[PDB]
């Protein structure tokens, strides 16, 4: 008691673009967020700070735990609750479902203390932590440029169904970034077209260089990429993988080459 339950929801990256790398280790990206209906459910409840998940992340390594520390740091309050987190956002996915836990998680417990902190101020605590993050404070369609944290809302012609074909393979976003050559990156100018497009409905127009990256690292991710072919649609890939998303349904045939694989098969309706 009182225990809550907050809908932690997924992103993915309708196209990506590097700019180049940055002094801070880091690349300037331009990219297109998208809020997708596929959640963690997260219960909060009074108590000892605790942060738990269904999947055994340590308590000291989740982004949640980080953030809700640092709130006590820099506000002064201390923090009574005990999370519990069902993942079903798998870590290593490209869809940003710890960021996701680390945002919903702290502006609700910012709301239940009476708001100490702005939304100006939380977007500063939760993007400190994860570039990713701030987009979940507004959700929906969003351009990410800087290295993702400075956002613009967008309407999308966007909709229908989507599905994401997740190995069962966690690709690492640093191992990813670290294999960028000079030929990768792109001018701004070109990817502001190409992000114009794709907001326009234009799904065709979507890439994404760490997916090109992430399926030379990672073989299970080309394997289902080659799968989505062979099935007919064009294959994508959200962040830095593992993800492979597409614009149709699952057929019977995915859905045994997903459970015979291991595979995790979301149908979602944008
Ligand atoms: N705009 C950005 C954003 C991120 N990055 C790179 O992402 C890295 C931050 N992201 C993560 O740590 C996400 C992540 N790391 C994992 C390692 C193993 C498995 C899953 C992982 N997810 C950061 O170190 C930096 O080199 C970057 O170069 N430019
Ligand atoms: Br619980
Ligand atoms: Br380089
Ligand atoms: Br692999
Ligand atoms: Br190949
Ligand atoms: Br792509």
Excluded: C
Excluded at 23 to 31: A, M, Q, W
Excluded at 115 to 124: A, N, V
Excluded at 176 to 181: A, D, E, F, K, Q
């Amino acid at each position: 008691s009182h225990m809550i339950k907050v809908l932690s929801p997924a992103k993915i990256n309708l196209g990506l673009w590097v700019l180049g790398r940055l002094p801070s280790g880091y690349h300037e990206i331009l990219t297109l967020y998208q809020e997708i209906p596929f959640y963690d459910e997260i219960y909060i409840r009074e108590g000892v700070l605790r942060v738990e998940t269904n999947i055994g992340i340590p308590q000291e390594e989740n982004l949640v735990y980080k953030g809700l520390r640092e709130f006590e740091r820099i506000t002064g309050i201390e923090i009574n609750y005990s999370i519990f987190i069902q993942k079903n956002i798998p870590p290593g996915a490209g869809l940003g479902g710890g960021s996701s836990n680390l945002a919903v998680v702290l502006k609700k417990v910012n709301e239940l203390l009476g708001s100490p902190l702005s939304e100006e101020e939380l977007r500063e605590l939760v993007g400190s932590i994860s570039a990713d993050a701030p987009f979940f404070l507004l959700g929906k369609s969003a351009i990410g440029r800087g290295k993702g944290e400075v956002l613009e809302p967008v309407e999308t012609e966007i909709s229908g169904k989507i599905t994401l074909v997740i190995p069962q393979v966690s690709s690492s976003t640093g191992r990813v970034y670290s294999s960028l050559r000079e030929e990768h990156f792109v001018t701004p100018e070109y990817a502001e077209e190409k992000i114009q497009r794709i907001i326009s409905g234009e799904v065709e127009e979507i890439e994404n260089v760490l997916g090109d990256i992430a399926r030379e690292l990672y073989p299970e991710i080309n394997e289902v990429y080659r799968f989505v072919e062979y099935l007919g649609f064009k294959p994508f890939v959200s962040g830095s993988g593992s993800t492979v998303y597409f614009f149709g349904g699952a057929s019977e045939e995915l859905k045994k080459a997903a459970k015979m694989r291991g595979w995790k098969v979301v149908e979602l309706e944008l």
